[PDB]
């Protein structure tokens, strides 16, 4: 009886040691994962701090326009930052019946959609006589002629018959003493702010009355019966995409 039972005792001691040795690996793994989670928490906190230092900043948008929403009377340049008019240019031509098309008024929408934060852009309209610029809700009617008013989801500044104008409420004559060349549109989603500025001196022109958007807003441009194109000033790209010499780069032009 003794012999086989002490075989069994030795066998049991055989697996007791392996069971003991299987503990340190698990504990070491748990501690190393504690270290990993501490490191990832540090990285996450740094990311959160950097994104807190994020969008409290005014964002100068590099506006690119959308050809699919451009009116058939309108024509876009090769760089998609210039729009002009040309009557009877798409009469019966191959144009798809896109539901997002402006086919009532001569207008075109920016490709960018804004949902929060402060963002502004600049437009060159010195060469035209009838320009409308501003902000629109993404759900504005497109098929039929609409009214460019905040009631319909439009916050715009207008030129009509050589006179500056508000949201097209004709009771808000703008007594601007000098003719405009560059106009700045400013948007603030949190406070419902739609401001217009004279970009020569960066002075106030008109703030539309605050109205909560709750819809992704989008820049909206409209060119009257003036063949002169409208230029949206590109953002300050810098020396990006160019070879910089050692004596500096002077007077870049493209």
């Amino acid at each position: 009886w003794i012999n086989k039972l002490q075989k069994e005792k030795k066998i049991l001691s055989g697996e007791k040691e392996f069971e003991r040795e299987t503990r340190e690996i698990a504990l070491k793994e748990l501690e190393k994962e504690r270290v990993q989670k501490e490191e990832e928490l540090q990285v996450k906190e740094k990311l959160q701090e950097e994104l807190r230092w994020r969008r409290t900043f005014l964002h100068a948008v590099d506006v690119v326009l959308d050809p699919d929403t451009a009116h058939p009377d309108l024509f876009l340049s090769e760089d998609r930052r210039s729009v002009r008019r040309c009557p009877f240019r798409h009469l019966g031509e191959s144009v798809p019946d896109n539901p997002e098309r402006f086919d009532s008024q001569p207008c075109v929408l920016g490709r960018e959609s804004f949902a929060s934060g402060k963002h502004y852009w600049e437009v060159e309209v010195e060469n035209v006589i009838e320009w409308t610029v501003g902000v629109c809700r993404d759900s504005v009617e497109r098929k039929g002629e609409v009214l460019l008013i905040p009631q319909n989801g439009f916050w715009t500044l207008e030129m009509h018959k050589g006179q500056y104008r508000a949201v097209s409420s004709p009771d808000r004559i703008l007594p601007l003493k000098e003719s405009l060349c560059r106009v700045g549109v400013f948007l603030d989603y949190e406070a419902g702010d739609v401001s217009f500025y004279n970009m020569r001196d960066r002075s106030h022109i008109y703030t539309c009355p605050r109205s909560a958007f709750s819809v992704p807003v989008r820049p909206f441009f409209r060119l009257g019966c003036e063949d002169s194109p409208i230029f949206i000033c590109p953002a300050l790209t810098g020396a990006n995409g160019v070879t910089v010499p050692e004596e500096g780069l002077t007077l870049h032009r493209v």
Partner: protein, 219 residues
């Protein structure tokens, strides 16, 4: 004790003997002819497959990993330490650590390109100067018709011809890299004396948009 001692001393002495042979053996004439007499025997061909994952988002690479071309607008593709985010650079898939290899780039009639090799541990996040000190041993054409080598400072190169094709030869043991005019077999440039650290990678960059991309000839 003599096993590694031989592989140290004899190979070091052979390397220095070949370096000294370079001076006295180029002291002869410039009989640069039969470009295929040495480019296939001394150096073995390498078929460079491009890596359409380390490329800048701005670059389009054909499905065959031959051509890299600057696309119209930057893309938004998933990024990682493999992807260059600023330099308009693309790397081949394979790395070289020993032996001697070569590859031919058909630059066509472009106006701006840069080709060469780079270290395995290159800084792919941000802007880092492309110099031998960092690990980018490259050269090429800029300013339309100006040929330059990316040294510190960058060096203009006087060429009597226009290289439509450029052959890059790497020899890890000697540690010398050469760019030749594969059109006529002439010698364009050669970085000497270079002591590598880790594996080397083909590199291509183009800061412009043209109808013709950077084609890579097979092995």
């Amino acid at each position: 004790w003599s096993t590694m001692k031989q592989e140290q001393s004899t190979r070091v002495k052979l390397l220095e003997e070949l370096r000294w042979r370079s001076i006295q053996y180029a002291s002869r004439g410039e009989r640069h002819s039969a470009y295929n007499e040495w480019k296939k025997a001394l150096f073995k061909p390498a078929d460079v497959i491009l890596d359409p994952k380390t490329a800048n988002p701005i670059l389009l690479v054909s499905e065959d990993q031959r051509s890299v071309q600057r696309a119209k607008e930057p893309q938004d593709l998933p990024d990682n330490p493999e992807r260059f985010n600023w330099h308009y650079c693309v790397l081949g898939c394979e790395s070289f650590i020993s032996g001697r290899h070569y590859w031919e780039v058909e630059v066509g009639d472009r106006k701006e390109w840069h080709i060469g090799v780079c270290s395995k541990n290159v800084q792919r996040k941000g802007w880092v100067k492309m110099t031998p000190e960092n690990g980018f041993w490259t050269m090429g054409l800029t300013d339309g018709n100006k040929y330059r080598t990316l040294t510190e400072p960058r060096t203009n190169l006087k060429l009597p011809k226009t290289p439509k094709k450029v052959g890059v030869f790497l020899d890890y043991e000697t540690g010398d890299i050469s760019f030749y005019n594969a059109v006529d077999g002439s010698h364009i440039h050669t970085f000497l004396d270079v002591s590598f650290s880790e594996a080397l990678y083909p590199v291509f960059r183009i800061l412009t948009l043209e109808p013709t991309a950077l084609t890579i000839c097979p092995a």
